[PDB]
Amino acid sequence: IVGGYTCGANTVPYQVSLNSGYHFCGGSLINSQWVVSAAHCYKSGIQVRLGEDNINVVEGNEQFISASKSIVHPSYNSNTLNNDIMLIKLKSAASLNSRVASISLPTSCASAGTQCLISGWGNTKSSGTSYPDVLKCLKAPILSDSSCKSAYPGQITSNMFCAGYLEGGKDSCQGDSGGPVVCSGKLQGIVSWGSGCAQKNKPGVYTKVCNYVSWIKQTIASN
Ligand SMILES: N=C(N)c1ccc(/C=N/OCC(=O)O)cc1
Ligand SMILES: [Ca+2]
C-alpha cells in the first residue's frame, strides 16, 4: 500500500496473509472455512495466516491454517486478468473472535464515489521497494467506469473497477494482490492489477466481487 496508514493491530480482522514460505498475497476471510483471493495469487502449498498484524513476528493472536484446496475461477484469463478471483478452503475451520472475523459478501454492487478500505502488506513505495511489517490501510474512492476505461483503454472488462486517485501518490501495490477492497462493510473488490503503483492517471484495478456471489455460493456449497 502506497500513501496509506498503519491500520492498527487486528482492526481488519478479515484480512489474511497467504504464505508459501514467505508472504506473497493477501486474501479475505468470508466464513470460518473459506478465503477469497485473486486467481493470479494461485500456487500450491498455501498456508493461510489469520489474525496477523506484524507478519514477521508471532504476536499471540495468529491462526496458521493450511489450505486443503484452491479453486481458480473457471473463466480466469491470466493474460487479461479477467475473472481474477479464487477461493481457498482451510483444512480446519478458523476460530472466529474479535481478531479473526469474516467479511460479508455483497448483495448489490458498490457505487462510484464510495470510499472503500484497501489493506495489505505490499510495497509502500511508488518507485523503489520497501515492505512494511505491520498491516497497512488506504481509504480510496471507486472511480467512474468511464474514467477507469480512459485510464486503461481496451483493458477494462465488466468484471473490473478502478479505485484510487488519478493524481497518483495513493494506491495498492505488489504484495497487496488478492487482498480486500471493502465498501460499506461488504467485500466489493480484490486487489488485482494496475500500471505500477500510485502513478498519475493509473489507478488500481480491482476484481468486481459482486459479479461472483452466485459462483462463490455454489462453489462453497459443493466443496
Ligand atoms: N493498484 C495497483 N497499482 C496494483 C495492484 C496490484 C498489483 C499486483 N501485482 O501482482 C504481483 C504481486 O502482487 O506480487 C500491482 C499494482
Ligand atoms: Ca504476526
Side-chain angles (χ1 to χ4, degrees):
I1 299 287
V2 178
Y5 61 101
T6 296
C7 303
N10 314 113
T11 62
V12 190
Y14 51 85
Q15 173 80 54
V16 315
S17 169
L18 306 188
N19 184 289
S20 62
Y22 45 88
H23 166 86
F24 71 88
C25 271
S28 304
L29 190 65
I30 61 158
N31 60 42
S32 63
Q33 291 182 279
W34 290 93
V35 164
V36 167
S37 188
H40 85 260
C41 292
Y42 169 78
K43 65 170 67 185
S44 58
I46 294 175
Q47 190 189 55
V48 176
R49 305 186 157 206
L50 310 197
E52 289 281 22
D53 192 43
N54 189 318
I55 48 162
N56 276 130
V57 180
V58 171
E59 294 179 287
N61 296 307
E62 300 88 348
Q63 295 177 51
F64 298 172
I65 305 170
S66 296
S68 61
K69 51 188 96 166
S70 284
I71 302 164
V72 168
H73 191 281
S75 301
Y76 171 57
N77 180 317
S78 59
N79 297 149
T80 62
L81 295 185
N82 197 25
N83 310 293
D84 192 11
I85 186 171
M86 165 185 74
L87 283 158
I88 300 168
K89 192 183 190 190
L90 304 178
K91 276 190 163 65
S92 61
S95 169
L96 304 181
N97 49 56
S98 65
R99 298 180 182 90
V100 178
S102 57
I103 183 75
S104 292
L105 288 178
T107 54
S108 73
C109 301
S111 289
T114 296
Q115 290 286 337
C116 306
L117 179 71
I118 307 174
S119 47
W121 292 276
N123 193 0
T124 62
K125 303 299 207 65
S126 63
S127 284
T129 306
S130 184
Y131 283 84
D133 48 10
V134 293
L135 184 67
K136 300 294 187 162
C137 277
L138 173 68
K139 294 221 178 147
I142 295 173
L143 300 179
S144 66
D145 285 333
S146 65
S147 68
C148 188
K149 298 165 72 63
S150 291
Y152 295 103
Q155 298 160 76
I156 305 300
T157 72
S158 59
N159 300 311
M160 301 172 190
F161 67 91
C162 288
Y165 299 89
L166 297 170
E167 288 307 298
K170 290 174 168 63
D171 202 359
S172 58
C173 200
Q174 282 70 43
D176 293 323
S177 286
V181 183
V182 162
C183 317
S184 308
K186 307 298 184 162
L187 184 64
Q188 296 282 9
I190 299 158
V191 181
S192 187
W193 65 277
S195 171
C197 312
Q199 300 301 295
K200 180 180 181 170
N201 292 138
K202 294 294 167 172
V205 189
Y206 298 94
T207 309
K208 190 168 176 166
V209 175
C210 61
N211 292 354
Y212 298 97
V213 172
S214 185
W215 171 75
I216 291 170
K217 287 174 181 298
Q218 292 185 137
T219 300
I220 290 167
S222 302
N223 294 271

